[model samples]
Target: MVLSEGEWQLVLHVWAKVEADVAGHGQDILIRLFKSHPETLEKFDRFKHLKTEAEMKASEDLKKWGVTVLTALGAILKKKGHHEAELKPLAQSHATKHKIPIKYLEFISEAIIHVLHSRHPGNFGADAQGAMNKALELFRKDIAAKYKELGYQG
Candidate 1:
């Protein structure tokens, strides 16, 4: 999807709010994920046994890694093609080493959208959702292609 300059601006604007409290927002997003797809937590040994919101919220690794991933995504959105070199390796690792299923990634995108809308409330409308969805679709495609290249069947 081709996003206009305005659409990109909308995405960045919403992201700023979404990332204001990195740990808090990360916890929100992760909790959403675990609630929606309980099986996904099984992939992370650290989060596997976290049954309470407080436990997940206090998880140092989850907070750090979530911020890292979100930060990388911001870089990708801002720099566009320039950071593919950095992104490709991470995509490859998720595909080959972590063996992350595309469905979980999709779930993450949905969770992100949900959080953004929840955070912004009146500010995030259909146009913002469309822009975010397009960006995530592109992200999902790249990761899937990398997974395919790595000979991982998903």
Candidate 2:
């Protein structure tokens, strides 16, 4: 939310490419998320059976939900300062209806950054890491705060 002027430009430039195939890149993020934290798969009933990257890469469900993650973040990217306004409803739903734990939100952010760096080689530069990290930190922070607000035990 507090990204400097130049930092915004840095993310947008590469994000444009990522957005071109949001599903593919986003799927990769989820794959990476599950890889980094295997326990995360337990949270996803649909993906709980996938114990390896091969199974994850082969699942259309993974691809579909990938779109969900990327689209959410893409919306936040379009308007950085208002993350809470954008995420409040989604966060609330996840808290009460979906019952997603907050730490999984944190994992997705990590997955996004790791995927960005790995997929975009030249475009996702070192400096971009900080910008993306900061942006996503605030984005997820808003969601975390929302969970707390709604008396979310997760």
Candidate 3:
């Protein structure tokens, strides 16, 4: 699901707000994801003892990971239609070594939409939300396809 030019404009505008407070917004996404799906937290050894958002906020690895995640998303957004080329190897590795399932990717995309909406309540209207949703869905699809191609059972 590709975004229309105007929709891309809205998404980019919202992302500008995200970039302004990368750690805060990024952590917001992670915190929401963890709370919404506690099982996901168990996948991270660093989070086994984490009991609250404050604990997550205090973890340097969480901060670095949040930054890394946002950076990857930023690269995908910048590459637009060419994201698959750039992301395929990473997806393959995740499917192989990390054994991260596609569900996690879907959850992250959902969490991204949630974060954008929650963070910019007044600024993110229907059009902006739709654009962001479609963009993330496309990204999820690309990664899932790589998993399939690499014979990932999960």
Candidate 4:
């Protein structure tokens, strides 16, 4: 199934945070992402003091302004499609550069869910976990597709 708007918001929110692992301007991008699309909190784990209630409120404010922020980001990515080819290097490099443990990538998505609930009490329960699993699967699939298109094997 395709991701819901809230899910996309969560994805974008998480990307904004992790964007720092990519380039120097990532944190700024994160700020823009949040400022432009505030409802992103629906998918975050800002509650329980994970990301802070203020951050969640900011995203809520973003949503009120419409979904322009994250959509613009995706549009930019779509327009500059070469970035798709960098998915693996991005993921692997992030892990290597930050010394992130293998399980963290998968589990960290949980933090997103926690933030979401903390910000806006929910009943996502199993769906959250399932959605995250699907997201990870899609991520690998995207990387593999790009790798095949690039004719590389590692």
> Clash pairs of candidate 1?
none
Query: What overall lDDT, based on C-alpha atoms, would model 3 receive against the true structure?
Result: 0.81
Count of steric clashes across candidates, in order: 0, 0, 0, 11
lDDT rank order = 2, 3, 1, 4
Clashing pairs in 3: none
Model 3, stretches more than 4 Å misplaced?
A: none
TM-score of each: 0.88, 0.91, 0.90, 0.34
In candidate 3, what are the lDDT values of residues 44-93, reduced to their tens digit? 78767888777887887777788878987887876665787778878877
Model 4, range 1-154, lDDT digits (tens) per residue?
3566666555455444434333222223333333444443234343223254466445543343333333433433332233454465554544444343333333433443444344334444455545545565455455445445545432
Q: After superposition, how far is residue 58 of candidate 2 from its true place, in Å?
A: 1.1
Model 1, residue 46: what's the lDDT? 72
lDDT of 4 at 47: 25
Which candidate comes out best when scored by lDDT? 2
